Amino acid sequence: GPGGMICYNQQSSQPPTTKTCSETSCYKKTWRDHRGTIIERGCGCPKVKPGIKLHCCRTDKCNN
Amino acid sequence: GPGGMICYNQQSSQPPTTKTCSETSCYKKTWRDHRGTIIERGCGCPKVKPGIKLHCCRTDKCNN
Amino acid sequence: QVQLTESGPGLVKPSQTLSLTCTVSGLSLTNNVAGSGWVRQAPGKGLEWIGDISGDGVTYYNPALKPRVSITKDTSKSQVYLALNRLTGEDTAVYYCVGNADVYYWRDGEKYWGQGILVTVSSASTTAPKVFPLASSGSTVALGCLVSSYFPEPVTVSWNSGALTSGVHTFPSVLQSSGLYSLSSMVTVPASSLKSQTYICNVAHPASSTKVDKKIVI
Amino acid sequence: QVQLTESGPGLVKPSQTLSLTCTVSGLSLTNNVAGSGWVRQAPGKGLEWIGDISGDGVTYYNPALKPRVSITKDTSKSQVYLALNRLTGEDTAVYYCVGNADVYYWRDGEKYWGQGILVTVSSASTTAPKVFPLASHSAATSGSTVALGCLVSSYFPEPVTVSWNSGALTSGVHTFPSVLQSSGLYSLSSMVTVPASSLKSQTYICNVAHPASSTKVDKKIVIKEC
Amino acid sequence: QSVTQPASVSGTLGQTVTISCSGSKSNIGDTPSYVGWFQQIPGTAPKTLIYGDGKRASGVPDRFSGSVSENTATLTISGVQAEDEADYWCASWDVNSDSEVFGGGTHLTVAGGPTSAPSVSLFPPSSEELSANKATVVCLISDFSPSGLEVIWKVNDAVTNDRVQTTRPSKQSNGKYAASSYLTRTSTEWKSYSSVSCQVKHQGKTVEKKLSP
Amino acid sequence: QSVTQPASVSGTLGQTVTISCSGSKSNIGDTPSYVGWFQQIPGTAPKTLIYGDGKRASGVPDRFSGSVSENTATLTISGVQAEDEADYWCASWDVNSDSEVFGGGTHLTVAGGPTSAPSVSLFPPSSEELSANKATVVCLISDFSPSGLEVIWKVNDAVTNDRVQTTRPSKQSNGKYAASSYLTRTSTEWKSYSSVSCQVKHQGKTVEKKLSPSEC
16 A cells, blocks of 8 residues: 555454555454354464464455 | 374365474465466465465364 | 363472373363463462463473473373473472363363472472371360471371361461471361360371371370 | 666765656556565675565565665656665665566566666765877777777766767777776776778767766867877 | 563452453454453462453352453452452463463452451470470461461560461461461470460450460 | 575586575575576676576576576576676575565676787877876777786886776677776876886787877
8 A cells, every 4th residue: 555555454244444554464364253253354464373264465455 | 283283285286285394383375377376385374475375274284 | 070180299309300190081182272281380479381282282382491391192091291301499389280171262261270289399308297286265175286397398188087177277388497397287176075086187298108197185 | 668767866965865766667566466666786796675665555675774765656657766864885886776577476577677877975076077088109909990089087976978979989989997096086988999091081079978967078089190 | 471460459348349461462462362360269279260252161150250451351350259359360372472371460358357356276395296306386376357467476474586487377168267376496495484375466356375384 | 684696607608507596495495486587797787587486588598597496596508608708696585574685696707719819009198187287098908808917007117006007807899808007197207207108918928008208
């Protein structure tokens, strides 16, 4: 993006929302609960706990 | 994972193969070519260059 | 029912390796995201995580202890083993075996703790305790026995082999200038059952592998 | 037809900010995995990457320069801009604009270079060159051919170009590398070998160009007998 | 990684109380969330109150609850019973160090219960111990609340303070408190003294017991 | 991050040559692969020989090829020609520092061409320059191969080494080499000298040219 990497930050199947980020990376964690599959989107590429599937990428609006 | 995390290392759609790893994480890089999508599997969670979609996970043989 | 039972030496030499075993009943040592491991608490110190081994055999150790820590497991025997080398006095502590009944992700489930196993690191050798009697409202009287001059600190006390639990209290220990520990156990009893009922304590010093049974008669 | 043209000052003072522009023709400043940026080469030094801006506007800077570098772009104007502050003599170098025609991933495509722009960091001011003629009886390269030239003397900063007869004369021409005299100024020589018979029939002028001083000298080489 | 919790918290019976555990996004703030809260009565093994995502463990009273806001977690006891007086530990998992981190602990003192006078039992050096040329007079105070008291040994009839070692009070099975003090001398010292005495000061009261050879 | 390549490589005309670039798994060894190879003629801008995954750039001769094994990349010139004598740079992208890293450069000297004797052209100080109390004698050596030579200035007939500045030989458009030497004196010094001389030693031969001050 103009000011930094633009990236999705919505949760699970919510309406897509985007955030400007100072990180050059963007992430989509996914895990499971009694409720089902839970997805979480944001910037950076964080370290996760075992059981969480991490997917990160380094282009604008790539973490859908 | 008797001696470490066990994880897939096959390439693209080749027959699944596995290897033992001292890292506590395991990865699936995917990118594109004129030939199509190219997948690369291994252990750790390496940093990638823009254009590569990195997936990684921390359970035995999770990176299929 | 979950039951985690630690076993091992209560006294280890500063130039050895501390090896503890934990037998597990009621938990899974096979779930990929479930862990079982070791925490410890040293005197006047907080809880310190030692490490974990997962259902896949993957280990995660406390970075500050990584060079001396090895955790392994045998699911056939349903046991988890801890080994800590390059021992120091700072490694003297209560070691708890812990199990994580996780389901979907790391630490998403209930954590179960064991009773604990006190391990002392010293170049000194074990000293068995001396059990001395303590006898001297008029409706109820108080007796006891004082366990004197023992090392390391872990000592257990029972009364009438556990048959007597009402009115009983075992006290915390004390470090005398001599360098050994002493504690007192007591029970309040009916004045009427003084000459007709028997009052014995059972002291157990595991580090010296000793069990004393001392009759309290006035 | 790819063409990457750098523009900017050839002389900057140590307490200013170097601002360079690069006009791009034939490439895409819009592919998310394609970059366009700046490399530099200091005298007697190796190639040093300054930075890149991607089709998404994401920047990647050389960490060793990160606090002082800013790369931006104007896609409407098809231009990429570099800004480097806290300048020192160590920032004196040739700055190349570069473009990466990547397709599927970072740096998977061909790399295109601009012609480079020399930027000198100095508190000194520009000095235009004094073009002196070079003709001598002792310049007889061979028996059928003579050598003439012109010496570009005492100029600063270093970027200077030399032509002969406004580019009509290119055969037998050679411009030499520059030299730094004790004065702190630069000097170079350009030469051309010509037929001895044409000395009285052909005119031979050299055209020196000093861009930092916005000067163009034309020196006719006159072959006079004493 | 370090998580910090208050060193001590006080509450009255029936009052709602909170213990807070402050950390970082790498641990307490990591998602999916894990913040464990464990109760430990000094000298006991820890018992898990809250686990995982602020979930109450099996068999834990309803008054215990766990919550998390950003990088700060909080255990809430909604109506503190006196059985709740104890040490409380918070734990989390840090993803940057792949490690479980504990807080410094917080001692919860639940005060406001009924007052009880201390029963003092003063025992004499055993004939065997004196057969070892050592004398230990043993003062055992029991069944007293509040937790605090002062113990004073006296050799003969004046208070003397040499080799006196007292233990910090600890809860009993009935809910009251107990403490022990040991006066250690050489056998000759004891057999030479006219009278030793152990005095207990608690809640304004004074209970002295005396024993002589 | 740091990638290292040899400082110099030599090859004979027609001989196959390789320039190697050693790095790490974070850069040269990173997959998908990127290792660029660029040719630079001293004083010009670099041209891309190899790009991306060892792919040959547009218009680059077939004799240039690029390969990678583990963390070491290699440029292969199959049949070095005289035009190939030049500096060669390797570049890669390091993902741990998100940065492009270049090697130290490698100078390829293509030897085995025909030998040519140096033409020496000696030029005196111009009258304009002398009007400023400055004298610059200019010795221009041209059309010589191989590149190496020695320049010797002489005032009168004795060898002098003060205020002498020679440039390192450089290729000409025709393929031979050229060099320039400058003798700097004060106008009085020049007009006082009986004879200045520029001598060139090359391939065992010696070519001397001489000048003397005049009032032209």
